[model samples]
Target: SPGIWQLDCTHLEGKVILVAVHVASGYIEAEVIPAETGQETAYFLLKLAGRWPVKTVHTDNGSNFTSTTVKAACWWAGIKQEDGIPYNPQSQGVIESMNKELKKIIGQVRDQAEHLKTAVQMAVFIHNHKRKYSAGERIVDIIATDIQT
Candidate 1:
């Protein structure tokens, strides 16, 4: 299903938000919040569930991973929580690659802004959902796979 997932520590000015996208379908949603604890993580997951079943989830090392809220959500959703080791260089290679690509596209806009945060947000939105990766692939396409039976 197309939906939102909270990206921990992505907030600016009391708002923590992230966008999750389905590349093939062009589906996207933004999950906005202030902090990410187990409670917040659980809330985010529950919101994404609505009526859909989520079988898998991936994340990095953050306090939210160990939070009881997230633990409970995983138990209820029957979702396997996968975490990447902080020190693993290969863990976030794709994201690192995206960062470089995004910088090339959005760096100028970010540099021109009095409100850098806003510029960053727009950049991320464009990068995560609208931008094409690898010929014609996009994040939206990747997430859309979840809804296929």
Candidate 2:
């Protein structure tokens, strides 16, 4: 169950879409409302961590939660956060590029918020079934292989 949920965000007209991608599987896991109140980003990670054994959270340096909040989540959950030098915040390119691709299809239908919610869900679902680059595997299938009850 060990995995990395790399963090990122998507901005639309009014609100923000928080994006956390599985580093190994290229699995895109996005959520709405979101809260850990669990409290926003903490809520996001905790929900997914429930599904997958999250060993570490790598931040993009620009994700929604304040540094202390995410760091606290990491500590409380027995998970690790990206630290020190080499992780390279800008290298969070996977979701950045991935967001654009998601944007393309979601943007295609309509930019209005009326359907934006539905559109994001469908776009993400479609992406999961598509074959990933060079892997000859779909994102869902790859992630599925490691899932445990």
Candidate 3:
């Protein structure tokens, strides 16, 4: 970890936390907030769930997720909340894998150019629409399916 700098949202300067949901029956929501806390998370979730029914929600055991505000938001949304097991990869496998995917894409983009703005957008777009995993499917297609019906 010496040569590699820790990537975090703090450096993003209030850029929305990238909330990725399953493209098929999931919701990917992101928002930029001035601070990272339960209140902010609750606010983001409320704004995200407006007019949209949420069934289940999953997140890592960050303090924000454990906060009362977030808990109340989950209750209000009628969503079953689940947290990834502490220090266990299995509990949050999907998001973990996606994180890797995003990192890899960002790395490639960074290597290809000096400025990352375009690369970030391109990488995100590809990940959403074209990138495929073992099953050979695009995430955006699944999102479209979920939104369709």
lDDT of each: 0.52, 0.64, 0.51
Off by over 4 Å in 2: 33-38, 62-66, 83-90, 109-113, 133-149
TM-score of structure candidate 1:
0.53
lDDT of 2 at 111: 50
The ten-residue window of minimal lDDT in model 3 covers: 1-10
The TM-score of candidate 2 is 0.71
Stretches of candidate 1 off by over 4 Å are 1-8, 18-29, 51-53, 86-93, 96-125, 128-149
Question: Which candidate gets the maximum lDDT versus the true structure?
Answer: 2
- Residues 1-149, model 3: lDDT tens digits: 00100112222322434453543432233444555777876766676556444555554446855789989987887656665443445335556665666657666776675555455555565565552342114333444466776
2 against 3, candidate with superior lDDT:
2
| lDDT by residue (tens digit), candidate 2, 87-109 | 55554565568888878867775
Residue-level lDDT for 84 in candidate 2: 24
Better of 1 and 3 by lDDT: 1
Compute each candidate's TM-score over C-alphas: 0.53, 0.71, 0.55
lDDT of 1 by residue, 48-107 (tens): 566444555554345656877787887887766656443446335644554455556456
lDDT, candidate 3, equals 0.51
